[PDB]
């Protein structure tokens, strides 16, 4: 059903790529390590690695992470008392100019979901967007999250070009999951969440890097449920994105989906930019 095409490492204007970012919902740092997720990171050797759903505070990080080759500048965020839940990481070869946590809004800054790293020519945000939950019990909260998050990003983008990556917990369009018709009332494919996402692209503004390059390409997913061995049948969802400011599009080389990389129920995604 899907074969990600070869890595295009030069820009439309012929500039070689200078930055490789990789994002990955790891479904628990210790499970991911146990499943050889680190081995794959060493093969990708990104300039910056963003991790979501670490399920782990900084006080309890596995030693294998301290010894991650290349990525020495590491920033970690998690719920401060609740183990086994949410949590994000941002790991970089180069030291950022500034690193901050959350979105400036007390209600939305308790669950370790957002890290912002500022560099010379752009700002990188990684996020683990709140799931709407079984029975949509968190859908109202998610809509409030979506609005606060959008305003925050609009604010960052007014100063510097922006890259947002992570598990944004939404499949934008019907092409972004295998079973759109069965999922219109479920977390990840409700009109409210799909609308929030659409308005995010238009308000900041941001472009969906993968869909911009591959507008008609179906069956490209980043998440498959362990349930019923969905991955072996490619019954999945694209929940993981690189969204970028329109000003960065001339710098865009490729946006990749590493379908075969094991370690989680999500696969990694990888961006090439010529900055
Ligand atoms: Mg998970």
**Positions marked active-site:** 128, 167, 266
Please give the sequence-ordered ranges of beta strands (E in DSSP) within 65-157, or none if there are none.
73-77, 88-92, 98-101, 114-118, 123-128
Neighbours of 89 (CB within 10 A): 26
Q: Residue 229 annotated as binding?
A: no
The residues facing 256 across adjacent strands are 270
Residue numbers of the domain that contains 208: 1-275
Backbone torsion region of residue 117, taken as left when φ is above 0, otherwise alpha when ψ lies between -120 and 50, otherwise beta = beta
Helix (H/G/I), strand (E/B), else coil: 31: helix
Q: Residue 179 annotated as binding?
A: no
Q: Residue 58 annotated as binding?
A: no
The token pair that represents 3 in the structure block: 């074969």
Rounded distance from Cα 93 to ligand 1 centre (Å): 26
Residue 154 half-sphere exposure, CB side, CA atoms within 13 Å?
12
Gap between the Cα atoms of 171 and 178, Å rounded: 10
The token pair that represents 159 in the structure block: 């100063």
Neighbours of 23 (CB within 10 A): 27
Gap between the Cα atoms of 144 and 116, Å rounded: 20
Stretch (H or E) spanning 37: helix 37-44
- Placement of tokens 């390059």 in the chain: 213
Helical H runs in 45-138?
63-66
139-157 and 191-203 helices, crossing angle to 10°? 10
Helix (H/G/I), strand (E/B), else coil: 127: strand
**Which CATH number characterizes residue 217's domain?**
3.60.10.10
Phi first, then psi: give them for residue 74, nearest 5 degrees: -115, 135
Gap between the Cα atoms of 30 and 54, Å rounded: 8
Method by which the model was determined: X-ray
Gap between the Cα atoms of 141 and 86, Å rounded: 16
User: What is the DSSP secondary structure assignment for residue 175, as one 8-state letter?
Assistant: G
Report CA-CA distances (Å) from 65 to 22, 89, 112, 196, 233.
16, 11, 18, 34, 32
Rounded distance from Cα 168 to ligand 1 centre (Å): 13
Gap between the Cα atoms of 88 and 24, Å rounded: 10
Rounded distance from Cα 53 to ligand 1 centre (Å): 7
Tell me the resolution in Å.
Answer: 1.9
């Amino acid at each position: 059903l899907y074969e990600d095409p070869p890595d295009q490492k030069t820009s439309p204007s012929g500039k070689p790529a200078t930055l490789k970012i990789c994002s990955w919902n790891v479904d628990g740092l210790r499970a991911w390590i146990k499943k050889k997720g680190l081995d794959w990171v060493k093969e990708e050797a990104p300039d910056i690695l963003c991790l979501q759903e670490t399920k782990c505070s900084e006080n309890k990080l596995p030693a294998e992470l301290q010894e991650l080759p290349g990525l020495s500048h590491q920033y970690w965020s998690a719920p401060s008392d609740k183990e086994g839940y949410s949590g994000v990481g941002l790991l970089s070869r180069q030291c950022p100019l500034k690193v901050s946590y959350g979105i400036g809004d007390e209600e939305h800054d308790q669950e370790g979901r957002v890290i912002v790293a500022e560099f010379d020519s752009f700002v990188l945000v990684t996020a683990y967007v709140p799931n709407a939950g079984r029975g949509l019990v968190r859908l109202e909260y998610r809509q409030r999250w979506d609005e606060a998050f959008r305003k925050f990003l609009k604010g960052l983008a007014s100063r510097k070009p922006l890259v947002l990556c992570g598990d944004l917990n939404v499949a934008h369009e019907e092409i972004d999951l295998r079973n759109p018709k069965g999922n219109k009332k479920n977390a990840g494919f409700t009109p409210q969440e799909r609308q929030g996402f659409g308005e995010l692209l238009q308000a900041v503004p941001l472009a969906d890097s993968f869909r911009h390059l591959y507008p008609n390409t179906p069956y490209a997913y980043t998440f498959w449920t362990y349930m019923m061995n969905a991955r072996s049948k490619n019954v999945g969802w694209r929940l993981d994105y690189f969204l970028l400011s329109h000003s960065l599009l001339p710098a865009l080389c490729d946006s990749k989906i590493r379908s075969k990389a094991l370690g989680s129920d999500h696969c990694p995604i990888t961006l090439y930019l010529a900055l």
